[PDB]
Amino acid sequence: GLVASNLNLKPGECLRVRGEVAPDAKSFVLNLGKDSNNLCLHFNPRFNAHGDANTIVCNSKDGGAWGTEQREAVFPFQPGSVAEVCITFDQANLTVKLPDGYEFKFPNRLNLEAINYMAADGDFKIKCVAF
Amino acid sequence: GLVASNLNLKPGECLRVRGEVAPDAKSFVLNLGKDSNNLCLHFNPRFNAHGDANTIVCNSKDGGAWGTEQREAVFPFQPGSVAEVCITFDQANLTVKLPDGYEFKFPNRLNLEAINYMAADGDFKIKCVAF
Ligand SMILES: CO[C@@H]1O[C@H](COS(=O)(=O)O)[C@@H](O)[C@H](O[C@@H]2O[C@H](CO)[C@H](O)[C@H](O)[C@H]2O)[C@H]1NC(C)=O
Numbered sequence A, B: 001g002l003v004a005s006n007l008n009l010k011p012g013e014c015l016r017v018r019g020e021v022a023p024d025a026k027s028f029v030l031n032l033g034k035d036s037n038n039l040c041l042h043f044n045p046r047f048n049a050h051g052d053a054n055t056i057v058c059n060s061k062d063g064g065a066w067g068t069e070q071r072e073a074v075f076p077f078q079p080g081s082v083a084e085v086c087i088t089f090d091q092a093n094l095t096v097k098l099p100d101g102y103e104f105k106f107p108n109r110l111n112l113e114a115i116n117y118m119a120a121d122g123d124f125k126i127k128c129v130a131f
């Protein structure tokens, strides 16, 4: 899927991503960080993948190494609909805001100066990105 | 500037880009093609740069080699302002359209199946990209 680099997204600046969730979607991924080996956020809604169903999986990747996975109890995505996610960070957490009012936090484990890299993958057709 | 890859923009599909032209803008660049060495369009408004004044320069790049520059009289860009373009291509031309109705056309020299790559450079900050 789409890969964007040189984002230079600073603490407090908002990255917005709107896409279409495939009607038979199994999974999609938004990766954010410095590059493919250094992700401050791996955001992975799983509809029906890796033994999971309707679960948001989050993790980090630091110098190629996956961190400790975290999951949310809520799943505000529907196959066959448009979804928007808005991401920002401070030194402590990433804050991910989702459609139906939902907002959660994921610990900032890498302390990058900026989010420079985003990559999308899976069953999510990106329609627009706002920086 | 922002670099985006795995665009899979087909003929007819519209790439919409909105960005901020720096207040002291000397020139800016939007590159489109397969990758950084294979550009079906290098779109380069020069406010005052390389000996040009308020002239758009367009070119292609094929296997790392610049083609022949096309230039225009019409120059609807202003420093320190927001610029919106809509880009598309077909068999014949690339087209760059501005909201007010200006259309720039540049011949399609590479004849690629899709635009997969976009890059901004110079005094232009991309704020929003849509497909
Ligand atoms: C060691 O197996 C790993 O288990 C994780 C826990 O979930 S479970 O369903 O297996 O019990 C899996 O999520 C994990 O899958 C990987 O998870 C990372 C993010 O943590 C990312 O989504 C990868 O794409 C995904 O494969 C699984 N195996 C690994 C580490 O690949």
Ligand SMILES: CO[C@@H]1O[C@H](COS(=O)(=O)O)[C@@H](O)[C@H](O[C@@H]2O[C@H](CO)[C@H](O)[C@H](O)[C@H]2O)[C@H]1NC(C)=O
Pocket (backbone or CB within 6 Å): B042, B044, B050, B051, B057, B058, B059, B066, B069
């Ligand atoms: C062959 O040198 C090139 O001269 C062009 C002007 O020629 S002139 O006869 O009108 O004076 C310059 O446009 C050109 O600048 C380069 O142009 C490409 C697109 O064709 C791109 O914009 C580069 O960023 C720009 O440097 C110049 N070539 C150079 C400087 O190598």
